[PDB]
Amino acid sequence: KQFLSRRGKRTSPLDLKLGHNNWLRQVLFTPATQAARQAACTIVEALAT
Amino acid sequence: TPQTEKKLKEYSQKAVEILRTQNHILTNHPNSNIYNTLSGLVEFDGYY
Amino acid sequence: MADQLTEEQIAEFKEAFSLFDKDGDGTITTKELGTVMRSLGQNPTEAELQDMINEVDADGNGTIDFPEFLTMMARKMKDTDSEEEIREAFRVFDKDGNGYISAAELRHVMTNLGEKLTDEEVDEMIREADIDGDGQVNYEEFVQMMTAK
């Protein structure tokens, strides 16, 4: 499948490798409100199964 | 005091820079929304 | 067989093994065997893990020591796959042993994998895996396919 994507027309899936700067750090430590931080915590906890 | 043009530009730059920094401080303050909403409804002295 | 590995790699493997050692006997359990080399920067799959514990833990104890850990490790950083492995994959693909991987055998092997595709897609990949124009994958085609970079 990798070779087919390399030469043919099938889409190439992305690699599980995360950036160290993102919106996640912005949301997780926001001092405007606490519910945003809690919702971000729930989202990232659910992302790790 | 009569003064040269370069000093005048420096002075104006300092004033405008201080004003801009304080405006940025005000518009991103964590409690800015609460104070801005409370201003037009209740009468209060200080920011508690 | 492990002489091809530079000394610092053995040292860091020892560091990882000792840190992953629980009871201080220099021997660990196979449940965390995935995490040991999973922590070194390489990423295996569950089938990879089950096969690795199968190859070594023949007695079924579920416990790994250092020399056989080095045995497992020495066969991981190799880039050019051993021709025995490629030939064995060819044999698995060639269920009937005729040396030609037809579309139907591909369908069987993909369905057993749990994955689904249409007839058109598998025909398309077969015809892009063919160089002689006969629409049939042979050993030389497979070898030149896996050596392409």
Side-chain angles (χ1 to χ4, degrees), chain A residues 27-43:
Chain A
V27 178
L28 264 178
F29 289 107
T30 176
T33 176
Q34 182 218 335
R37 301 187 303 232
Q38 209 147 10
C41 291
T42 309
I43 282 305

Side-chain angles (χ1 to χ4, degrees), chain C residues 10 30 42 55 65 86 103 107 120 125 127 132 142:
Chain C
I10 293 62
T30 38
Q42 77 208 16
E55 173 167 350
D65 85 11
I86 273 187
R107 306 311 280 277
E120 199 267 330
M125 64 164 47
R127 82 185 94 184
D132 39 357
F142 199 100

Side-chain angles (χ1 to χ4, degrees), chain C:
Chain C
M1 49 78 105
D3 302 330
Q4 58 94 28
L5 220 55
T6 176
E7 291 294 324
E8 53 97 11
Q9 291 211 300
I10 293 62
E12 168 292 344
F13 290 158
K14 156 71 75 178
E15 207 80 19
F17 193 29
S18 34
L19 200 37
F20 274 110
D21 171 12
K22 314 332 181 173
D23 48 351
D25 66 350
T27 352
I28 64 167
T29 49
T30 38
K31 288 188 283 187
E32 270 70 40
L33 180 174
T35 321
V36 192
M37 79 270 269
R38 165 141 281 281
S39 75
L40 311 185
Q42 77 208 16
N43 329 93
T45 86
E46 192 37 11
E48 271 275 20
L49 254 183
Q50 189 37 267
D51 180 79
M52 280 336 318
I53 87 163
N54 175 26
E55 173 167 350
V56 167
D57 189 27
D59 43 349
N61 291 140
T63 299
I64 307 303
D65 85 11
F66 204 32
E68 54 156 30
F69 203 100
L70 255 291
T71 298
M72 307 190 203
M73 277 316 297
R75 294 101 61 81
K76 291 298 118 188
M77 48 310 301
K78 53 173 182 64
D79 199 11
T80 49
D81 176 74
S82 75
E83 295 318 308
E84 315 305 298
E85 278 287 273
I86 273 187
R87 179 231 62 94
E88 170 294 315
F90 199 74
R91 184 55 83 119
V92 151
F93 272 115
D94 214 70
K95 193 54 222 83
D96 50 353
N98 71 336
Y100 329 125
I101 314 150
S102 83
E105 301 133 357
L106 181 143
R107 306 311 280 277
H108 173 14
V109 89
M110 264 188 199
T111 287
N112 168 288
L113 257 185
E115 185 273 355
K116 284 80 49 206
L117 284 198
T118 59
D119 304 332
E120 199 267 330
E121 197 60 273
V122 285
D123 288 332
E124 201 81 16
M125 64 164 47
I126 276 276
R127 82 185 94 184
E128 292 154 60
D130 204 69
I131 50 166
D132 39 357
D134 70 334
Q136 178 41 263
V137 175
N138 277 9
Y139 176 76
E140 54 96 14
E141 268 159 326
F142 199 100
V143 170
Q144 73 97 30
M145 172 56 107
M146 296 337 192
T147 53
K149 300 163 228 193

Side-chain angles (χ1 to χ4, degrees), chain A residues 1 3-4 6-8 10, chain C residues 115 125 128 145 148-149:
Chain A
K1 281 184 227 169
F3 168 110
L4 211 182
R6 216 168 163 187
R7 186 186 286 179
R10 282 185 65 253
Chain C
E115 185 273 355
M125 64 164 47
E128 292 154 60
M145 172 56 107
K149 300 163 228 193

Side-chain angles (χ1 to χ4, degrees), chain B residues 11-27:
Chain B
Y11 293 0
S12 92
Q13 202 264 324
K14 269 150 179 295
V16 179
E17 199 273 333
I18 287 295
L19 181 62
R20 272 182 211 161
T21 310
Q22 299 302 324
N23 279 348
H24 185 96
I25 288 295
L26 261 311
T27 69

